[PDB]
Amino acid sequence: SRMEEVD
Amino acid sequence: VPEYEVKMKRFKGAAYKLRILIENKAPNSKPDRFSPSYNFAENILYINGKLSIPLPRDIVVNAADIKIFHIRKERTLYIYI
Amino acid sequence: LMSQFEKQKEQGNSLFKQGLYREAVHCYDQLITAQPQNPVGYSNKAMALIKLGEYTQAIQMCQQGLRYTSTAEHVAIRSKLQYRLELAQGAVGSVQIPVVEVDELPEGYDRS
């Protein structure tokens, strides 16, 4: 779960 | 009916790599309507219904950095990429 | 404790995860206003805008965000931005490029 997650 | 003629020139060590000149040569005449668009996958800069400039494949193209100036008196588009 | 910036960001992310994308954008905007060189505001805003179907605006936010990510320290966030960009570009196929009407070319532009 990374690219589609905000930062 | 407009009569467009295109010139292209490459540059080294500058903020841009390419300059495109689009010139209307038709004497009589009509004002030029321009709604350019850039297609990312094609790497083609469409100018209007008539005209499209595919861009050289060896150039990094950032649509944010495509600068287009229009000088009406000269009926000339200057495009810097 | 979280800084003001970090609390605004966390609030934005909470709204995002809730599916309140417009409000999230409203927080991320404050991130961009406070730290215009911080890529995270741009990346987050772009993701929210994408969730809203505002692909052209998302593209603009990625374009702006990537200005700040050219050094090694930002590689990770760079990847994020590049993902969003490629998503949004992919969605629209093309964008309008504005024509600037001028009496003469501004300085630094070769007429030769």
Numbering used by the authors:
A (entry chain C): 718 to 724
B (entry chain B): 264 to 344
C (entry chain A): 0 to 111
What does the paper say about this structure?
We determined the crystal structure of full-length yeast Tah1, bound to both the C-terminal segment of yeast Pih1264–344 and the C-terminal tail peptide (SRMEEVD) of Hsp90, by single-wavelength anomalous dispersion phasing of crystals grown with selenomethionine-labeled Tah1 (see Experimental Procedures) and refined to 2.2 Å. Consistent with earlier nuclear magnetic resonance studies (Back et al., 2013; Jiménez et al., 2012), the core of Tah1 is a TPR domain, which consists of α helices arranged in a repeating antiparallel right-handed helix topology. Unusually, Tah1-TPR contains five helices rather than the seven found in other structurally characterized Hsp90-binding TPR domains (Morgan et al., 2012; Scheufler et al., 2000; Zhang et al., 2005). The C-terminal 20 residues of Tah1 beyond the end of the fifth α helix of the TPR domain has no coherent structure in the isolated protein in solution (Back et al., 2013; Jiménez et al., 2012), but is fully ordered in the complex crystal structure, and forms the majority of the interaction with Pih1 (see below). The C-terminal domain of Pih1264–344 consists of a seven-stranded β sandwich with the topology of a CS domain—a structural motif also found in Hsp90 cochaperones such as p23/Sba1 (Ali et al., 2006) and Sgt1 (Zhang et al., 2008). The Tah1-Pih1-CS interaction buries ∼2,036 Å2 of molecular surface, which is in the range typically associated with constitutive interactions. Most (∼1,720 Å2) of this surface is buried by the C-terminal segment of Tah1. In the Tah1-Pih1-CS complex, the Hsp90 “tail” peptide binds in an extended groove lined by the helices forming the TPR domain, and interacts with residues from the first, third, and fifth helices.
The R2TP complex is found in organisms from yeast to humans, and consists of the AAA+ ATPases Rvb1 and Rvb2 (human: RUVBL1 and RUVBL2), a TPR-containing protein, Tah1 (human: Spagh or RPAP3), and Pih1 (also known as NOP17 and Pih1D1, but referred to as Pih1 henceforth; Kakihara and Houry, 2012; Te et al., 2007). Pih1 is the multipoint scaffold of the R2TP complex, coupling the Rvb1-Rvb2 hetero-dodecamer, the Hsp90 chaperone machinery (via Tah1 in yeast or Spagh/RPAP3 in metazoa), and the TTT (Tel2-Tti1-Tti2) complex implicated in activation and stabilization of PIKKs (Hurov et al., 2010; Kakihara and Houry, 2012). The biological roles ascribed to the R2TP complex are directly associated with its ability to interact with the Hsp90 chaperone system and function as an Hsp90 cochaperone (Boulon et al., 2010; Izumi et al., 2012; Takai et al., 2010). Here we present crystal structures of Hsp90-Tah1-Pih1, Hsp90-Spagh/RPAP3, and Pih1-Tel2 complexes that together define key structural links within the R2TP core in yeast and in animals and reveal how R2TP connects the Hsp90 chaperone system to the TTT complex involved in PIKK activation.
